[PDB]
Scaffold this active site. Structure first.
Site, PDB file in Angstrom:
ATOM      1  N   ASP A  50       0.892  -1.200   0.000  1.00 25.04           N
ATOM      2  CA  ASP A  50       0.000   0.000   0.000  1.00 25.04           C
ATOM      3  C   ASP A  50       0.922   1.241   0.000  1.00 25.04           C
ATOM      4  O   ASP A  50       1.616   1.528   1.000  1.00 25.04           O
ATOM      5  CB  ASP A  50      -0.796  -0.079   1.346  1.00 25.04           C
ATOM      6  CG  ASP A  50      -1.668   1.190   1.419  1.00 25.04           C
ATOM      7  OD1 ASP A  50      -1.906   1.847   0.411  1.00 25.04           O
ATOM      8  OD2 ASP A  50      -2.104   1.500   2.538  1.00 25.04           O
ATOM      9  N   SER A  68      -0.097  16.299 -11.468  1.00 23.22           N
ATOM     10  CA  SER A  68      -0.208  15.958 -12.913  1.00 23.22           C
ATOM     11  C   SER A  68      -0.433  17.281 -13.701  1.00 23.22           C
ATOM     12  O   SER A  68      -1.111  18.177 -13.157  1.00 23.22           O
ATOM     13  CB  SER A  68      -1.503  15.158 -13.022  1.00 23.22           C
ATOM     14  OG  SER A  68      -1.800  14.823 -14.370  1.00 23.22           O
TER      15      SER A  68
END
Ligand code: 0ZP
Length: 330
Positions: free
Chosen positions: A35, A199
């Site tokens: 994770d 992004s």
């Protein structure tokens, strides 16, 4: 040194991936969810309340000759989905894919919430975010990645998750045969303890790329792609039978639609999620409505690039002193 291990999705939806990990001497193999959104390695164990264990594989520290109780330390963790577990801490030898660390903290669960007991396929979690988010007190413990970096050939791990198929975690090297064209790297902020990055924009299907910063985390431990409400509405406005369903919790659409692709920017490079990856699957077996893999993160308060986005890429987690994240098409 390096290591390499196959990771397999737990069910036919790819809701999560497990990777075997060998803890202890002699080895006990447990299937862990790696994770990259948290920083604790905990497992179900011989200490966990019996009535809270449905078919998982437990670690029994008393059968490991290298385990030692870390005196005085306890841990307690809850995750974004509400589920939770706490316990005490041993250090023991832990190997993944061949790569062995001695002295890794293995958090032993005394209690787990009901989501954990009900899923028999995941026997605990191996956290790979930065060690600042670890829950052990009073001194926090390092992740398996941080304990490994001294010995690794290079201080990196890659995630290469498959679509309805198995994939790989590698530690310590980049496999140049796993991906196509070249990796683009973009900067990581560690200020909130995540592999967090920005992004540079998006495009839906074959329309225009819109340059807009979307700050998000790369999280192997979240199944879906959660983005801001107005980017997600721009994508489902191209799927004619898509709607937002309060009943089910998100956008759903007819299972028969061909969904368009979704592109996200990484610096000047573009990663394309094929639309079949965004068809998460049907809302119930037999149903003619399916649940979409792109949802709004307005309810979570951070954007999550989770396994729907990551498994369309080969992803490098560069854990040098200034970390970066690398993405290539594959
Ligand atoms: C020290 C605390 C730090 C912050 C720990 N880190 C986090 O909580 C992270 C939050 C961060 C992104 C801000 C999340 C973390 O990676 C953590 C790792 C999980 C924990 C449960 C076991 C599996 C690994 N992920 C999560 O908490 C995300 C959070 C989320 C919020 N909204 C929607 N999803 N959860 C998940 O993605 C679930 C699966 C899931 C949750 C909610 C809605 C879903 C809708 C459709 C499909 C999947 C959904 C994880 C999961 C997958 C497969 C089987 C599972 C069985 C039991 C329990 C969970 C299962």
């Amino acid at each position: 040194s390096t290591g390499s291990a196959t990771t397999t999705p737990i069910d036919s939806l790819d809701d999560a991936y497990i990777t075997p990990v060998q803890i202890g001497t002699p080895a006990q193999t447990l299937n862990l969810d790696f994770d990259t959104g948290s920083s604790d390695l905990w497992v179900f164990s011989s200490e966990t309340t019996a009535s809270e264990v449905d078919g998982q594989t437990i670690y029994t520290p008393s059968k490991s000759t290298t385990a030692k109780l870390l005196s005085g330390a306890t841990w307690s963790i809850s995750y974004g989905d509400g589920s939770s577990s706490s316990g005490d801490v041993y250090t023991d030898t832990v190997s993944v894919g061949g790569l062995t660390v001695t002295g890794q903290a293995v958090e032993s669960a005394k209690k787990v919430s009901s989501s954990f007991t009900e899923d028999s396929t995941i026997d605990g979690l191996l956290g790979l975010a930065f060690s600042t988010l670890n829950t052990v007190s009073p001194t926090q413990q390092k992740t398996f990645f941080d304990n490994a970096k001294a010995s690794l050939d290079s201080p990196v791990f890659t995630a290469d998750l498959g679509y309805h198929a198995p994939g790989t975690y590698n530690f310590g090297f980049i496999d140049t045969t796993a991906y196509t064209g070249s990796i683009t790297y973009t900067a990581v902020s560690t200020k909130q303890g995540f592999w967090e990055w920005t992004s540079t924009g998006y495009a839906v299907g074959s329309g225009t790329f819109k340059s807009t910063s979307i700050d998000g985390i790369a999280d192997t431990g979240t199944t879906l792609l959660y983005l801001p409400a107005t980017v997600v509405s721009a994508y489902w406005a191209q799927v004619s039978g898509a709607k937002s369903s309060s009943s089910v919790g998100g956008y759903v659409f007819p299972c028969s639609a061909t969904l368009p692709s979704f592109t996200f920017g990484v610096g000047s490079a573009r990663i394309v999620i094929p639309g079949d990856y965004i068809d998460f699957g049907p809302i119930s077996t037999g149903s003619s409505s399916c649940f979409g893999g792109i949802q709004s993160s307005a309810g979570i308060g951070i954007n999550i690039f989770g396994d729907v986005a990551l498994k369309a890429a080969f992803v490098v987690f560069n854990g040098a002193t200034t970390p970066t994240l690398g993405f290539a098409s594959k």
